[PDB]
Amino acid sequence: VNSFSGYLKLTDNVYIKNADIVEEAKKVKPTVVVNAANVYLKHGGGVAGALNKATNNAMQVESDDYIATNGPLKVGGSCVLSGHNLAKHCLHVVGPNVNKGEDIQLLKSAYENFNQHEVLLAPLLSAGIFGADPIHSLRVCVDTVRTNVYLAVFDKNLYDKLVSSFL
């Protein structure tokens, strides 16, 4: 039993809700919140910009030190950093950006990072300003993640369509 509330159950392990991931994280304080990161951990917009803003830019400061030490992530890769005031940890995961020409096949690799954590709060990878079809992102999530994932989705219109079309 966990403290997540109001989610629709899609499969044995995948749940979904129309919600702002920032407000969800502040309420639940999950062990792991997933960020929709880029390889440079430059948290300017989308989910990343919103999460970073909620940390008063502490996420960006920590991220800049991470990159200075380790260099950029890989598309499809991830790193674990602090969750600051939002969660214990933040798993920064880089889905392929279709608007950068990046290979959508890498979306499965991106979701595989979730399997290293027993429970996560997460957005649909490569969705939103990353330019991929969110219905496709959901399908890859369900077919790749085996651990317990709670998908937020703040956009109301995006959610009803994802539910109604889910197979």
Ligand SMILES: OC[C@H]1CC2(CN1c1ncnc3[nH]ccc13)OCCO2
């Ligand atoms: O999960 C979906 C991703 C992708 C997105 C934004 N997303 C968010 N998900 C959850 N909480 C959020 N807070 C702020 C943004 C956001 O949806 C439509 C446009 O891009």
Ligand SMILES: [Cl-]
């Ligand atoms: Cl995003």
